[PDB]
Design a protein around this ligand. Structure first.
Ligand SMILES: [Cl-]
Length: 186
């Protein structure tokens, strides 16, 4: 269990607004569509039997909710999901921070990115992501309840995008999924 905290993932950002009084238009709409229970369970956007095959278990149009009815409100095809403007530091990497509320032996954290031109009014599909991840982390250390992971960012990517993070356990077939709304500078 967990989700991305740096930058905040889509589900965790809405939880942090306060499920009883969402502020952003998108988080209000998510609560209207699927209830507060999705936000209370922000750390549980999983598929139990992924086993490294995520397209088997996460349908197109439902990536951010991982194909789960509980999380359908995360799938709204809106341009206003709150985003974080990101850039690498002077090392050339960006430091992701994952809040690991139930730490587990890890096979990988994979990071996918939306294709150039992706229109957020289109429901998010796997084919809207480049087929190969831009960053694949196979070794993580638990530090203060988190994984701090250094990734290069996708080169030449501009504007508002979705990073789709996949955490595959190595001790279980279960995986966790975090859409992360970001923007890249020119
Ligand atoms: Cl720096």
């Amino acid at each position: 269990h967990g989700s991305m905290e740096t930058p905040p993932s889509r589900v965790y950002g809405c939880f942090l607004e306060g499920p009883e009084n969402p502020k952003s238009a998108a988080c209000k709409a998510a609560v209207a569509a699927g209830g507060t229970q999705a936000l209370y369970d922000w750390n549980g956007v999983n598929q139990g039997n992924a086993n490294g095959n995520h397209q088997a278990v996460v349908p197109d149009g439902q990536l951010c909710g991982a194909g789960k009815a509980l999380f359908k409100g995360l799938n709204l095809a809106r341009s206003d999901w709150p985003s974080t403007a990101i850039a690498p530091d002077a090392s050339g990497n960006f430091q992701f921070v994952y809040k690991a509320s139930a730490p587990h032996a890890t096979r990988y954290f994979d990071f996918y990115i939306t294709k150039d031109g992706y229109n957020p009014e289109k429901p998010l599909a796997w084919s809207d992501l480049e087929p190969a991840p831009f960053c694949s982390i196979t070794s993580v250390k638990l530090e203060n309840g988190t994984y701090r992971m250094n990734c290069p960012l996708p080169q030449g990517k501009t504007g508002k995008h979705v990073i789709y993070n996949v955490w595959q356990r190595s001790d279980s077939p279960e995986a966790f999924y975090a859409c992360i709304d970001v923007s890249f500078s020119g």
